[PDB]
Structures are given as C-alpha cells and as structure tokens.
Structure 1
Amino acid sequence: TVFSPDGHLLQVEHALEAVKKGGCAVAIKSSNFAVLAVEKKNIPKLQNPKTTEKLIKLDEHNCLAFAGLNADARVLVNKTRLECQRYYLNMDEPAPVDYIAKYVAKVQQKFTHRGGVRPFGIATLIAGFKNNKEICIYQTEPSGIYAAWKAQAIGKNAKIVQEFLEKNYQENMEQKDCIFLALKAIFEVVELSSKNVEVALLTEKDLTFIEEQEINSMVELIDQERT
C-alpha cells in the first residue's frame, strides 16, 4: 500500500473493486425497526443450509450483513464479536452501533495503513441500535470510511439498486411497507426466485427472521407489478 503520483491509493482502490463482485445486500431503516435483506445464490440439490453467511448477529441488539469476500467476512466478524463483548465487560452496557461501526471501520483502516498486510476485501453495513432506542444503519467500506445512512445497498451493481431506494423512501414506513421496499429490489437479482433473497427483520431489540412462506406471498406481488 504505497501512494500514487496523482494522490490516490492502489490496494485500497483495488480492494474496493473486490466488493463489487459480491452478492447484493440491502438494509432499510424505519421508525422503530430496520428490515434487512440479502440476496445470495447457491447450487441446487446440494449445499444443505443457507450457510448463514449474511445477517450475522453480533449482540442482542445488532445485525451485520456483509458483502464481498465470503471468506474474509468471518475474520472481520470474529474480530468484531470479540470487541462487541469486550466493551460489554468494560462498560457494563450492550455495545451500541455507534461504537461497533467505529470499530469495524477501524479494523479495515488499521490494515491498509500497516506494512505488508493485505486490506480487507469486504464492506459490511451494520444495522444496530444506539444508546437510546434509535436505529442507525451504518455502512463501512474497505478504505475505512463509514456513514450512517437510512437506506443502503452494496455488492453487484450497487448503483441502480441504490437509485431505486432514493425514488420511494418515505420517512417512517410500516412493517410490511418497509419489507416490500427492500423486496422490490429483486430487479438486480436474476429470476426473482424466493430461493435467492433472505430477509431479516430486526425489531425492538429482538432480532428475528422471516420464514420462506412469507417471502413467497410478497414476491408473487412482483409478478403482477412487472407488467
């Protein structure tokens, strides 16, 4: 990681292109909850679970959905959960999303600055809770920067899906209205089948998933919407 004559970086600019070749993930904020949605593709007739790659928990009130190198996410998450509990032991409070996002972004920033260390090729978006009952969907980067969005998407073609969110994002949606917003972003994923999306509804400090039969009743509405 050595500077260039124009001032830009090299590995930090290369690793940022590695997350572009990853599965699409999208998190949308609401009033008192934040429904997440990650789209991943597997091989049929084999690969028994969903592998639980994305929608990883970090604490009782946190939810991380990575994008990028599927192998490098476990090291950043296992180095996050180690600090998600080290904070709880040193501050007697559950780790707020303001400290976790400042930590995950510090791990990637600590690697691009060191000598002889490959930078992390992943970019996660953490959607947890602050000190009070406020939800702030953060979003890291392989460079180390982060910002508290309100709707964000990363992975394969993270620009047109981010553009769709700008078109119909209201202030405080309802439960099913906020899920339909993220579930309207299946235009980026091919064939729009239910075996590709895996949503997760984080709500009132109690993380829960959504069964496969509920996403079928919601993806079928897209067929009548795609005409």
Structure 2
Amino acid sequence: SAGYDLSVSTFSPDGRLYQVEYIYKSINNNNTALCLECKDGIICCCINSNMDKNKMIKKNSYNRIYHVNNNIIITYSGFDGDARNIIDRARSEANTYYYNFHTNIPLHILVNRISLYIHAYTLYWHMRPFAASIIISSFNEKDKGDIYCIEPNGACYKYSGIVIGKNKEMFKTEIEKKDYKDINVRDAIEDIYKFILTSDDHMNKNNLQNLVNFSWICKESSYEFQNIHEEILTPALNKAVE
C-alpha cells in the first residue's frame, strides 16, 4: 500500500494486486443486483437503492437489465457507464459471431470473450480498469439455465444463483434457504420481494414498484428475454407480513 496501490500494473510486495480490490469496494457500495435459476427460467433482479432520495427519475426508466441476442440476460452492478461499455462490446461479439457462423454465440464463450475484454484493461499504465461486475444468464429447454459472474480482473465463474452489490452477503444467506432449482419461476418473484423488503437496509420499504425492476427468461416467455409486465408484479406484492 506504500505507493504500490497507485497504478493497476504494479504488484505489491505481498503479491496482491491493488487498484483492483479498490474496484471491488466500489461495486460493493453500489446498487445490488440479483440473479438466480429456477426450474423454468432464470429470474434476475436489480434493486436501485441509491435512487430513492432523488424523487425525480421517471418511474421505470432506469434499468440495469440488458439483453443480447434476445435470449441472454446481462445485468451488472457498478459504474453504469463502464458496464454499458461492456454490453455494447458483448453485443458486438454476438454480432461478430453471427456474421461468421449463422448462429447465436453460445453463452459459455460469450462470458470468455467478455472476461478477456474486461481483463485486458488490467495490464497497462494508462488504461483504467473497469468498475463493473457483470452477470450473464441464459435458459434453454434441452439444457437448463446457467449464470456466470464476471468480476473485475477476469474471473468468470459459473453460478446457480448470485447476488452482487452492497448487501450481497445478506441476500445469499436468504436465497440458499430454498432450493430454487425446484421452485417455479412465478412464485419465486414473491420470494425475492421478501428478501428486498427485509435484507435491504431500509432503502426500499413498501414503495418499490419503481426502485426495483427485473425480468426473466422462462417458459412462459418462450425462453426469450422479457421484462415482467406490471400486472404480474402486484400479485407478487402480497408481501403483507407482520
């Protein structure tokens, strides 16, 4: 830390590479993002907690749920600009694959190419490393869904459900209570609200039709990306407890 934490291209005497763990505390002070697999389709979640005091944003304008190829959900938790740079690069790779192969890019190599693009910035004097943790998901019928989480400095890791953001420790401990791989996707929306109401540090409280927004890729969406229509959110807002 004694001058070894200035540039991303220097190793500290204890081997740990600074300027990257500082990013990790940048994303961990950002709005949380959630993504877990069910027996019908992946359901994601983004709780825009930092946008509660503003009271001026359009109701459901802000959205961190992006899709590529109409069958791959990409959500992030970090700098909303740096991540948006990657999505356009994720879309570029998907386009580049189709121009060559007549086929949507398989997810397991989309996360590989994105992991290299994100990591390529952690190798230079000048370049500023990205400050975004990327969650990528896709569901198929012959093979069930799968979730990858591309942290800063590469490290694409396959999950069965992940939370990244400020309270990711208090969300994981509540998600692992139930094996959601056997839980339906319609009734999993109710469950994640109970976590948002409780595990969120009073940022969201009973007025969250706008702060939190999310989407699935499930059978009722024909295994294609789809934001949940508002007529399904409110039945899932039967959160009246105590």
TM-score past 0.5 threshold: yes
Unpaired runs of at least 5, structure 1: none
The correspondence for 2:239, drawn from 214, 222, 227, is: 222
Rate the CA distance shift 1:156–1:217 in 2: closer, same or farther, 3 A.
same
- What's the secondary structure of 1:79's corresponding residue? helix
Deviation at 1:30, TM superposition (A): 1.6
Partner residue of 2:188 out of 178, 203, 209: 178
**Which residue pairs with 2:21 in the alignment?**
13
Which residue is equivalent to 1:211? 229
Look up the match of 1:164: 174
Q: For residue 214 of structure 2, give the secondary structure of its aligned residue in structure 1.
A: strand
Task: State the distance in 1 between where 2:191 and 2:112 align.
Answer: 28
Structure 1 stretches of 4+ with a deviation exceeding 4 A read 129-132
1:171, 1:205 → 2: CA distance?
16
Q: TM-score, normalised by structure 1?
A: 0.90
Give the superposition deviation at 1:159. 0.8
Within the alignment, does 1:36 sit opposite 2:50 as a pair? no
Which residue in the other structure is 1:190 paired with? 204
- 1:111-190 to structure 2, matched below 5 A, reads 111-129=121-139, 133-186=143-196, 187=198, 188=200, 189-190=203-204
Q: Is the 8 A contact 2:27 2:79 kept in 1?
A: yes
- Which has the higher mean CA deviation after the structures are superposed, 207-216 or 80-89? 207-216
After superposition, the Cα gap between the structure-2 partners of 1:174 and 1:129, relative to the gap in structure 1 and judged at 3 Å, is closer
Cα 1:131–1:11 change in 2 (3 A) is farther
Cα RMSD over matched residues? 2.0
Equivalent in the alignment of 1:100: 110
CA distance in 1, matches of 2:105, 2:230: 31
Residue 161 of structure 1 deviates from its aligned partner by 0.6
Equivalence for 2:3: none
Cα distance change of structure 1 residues 86 and 101 upon mapping to structure 2, 3 Å threshold: same
Identical pairs, percent: 20
How far the C-alpha of 1:129 sits from its partner, in A, is 4.2
Work out the number of aligned pairs and report it: 223
Residues 192/137 of structure 1: CA separation in 2 closer, same or farther (3 Å cut): farther
- 1:66 and 2:76 are equivalent in the alignment: yes
TM-score (norm 2): 0.84
Q: Aligned partners of 2:28, 2:194: CA distance in 1, in Å? A: 21
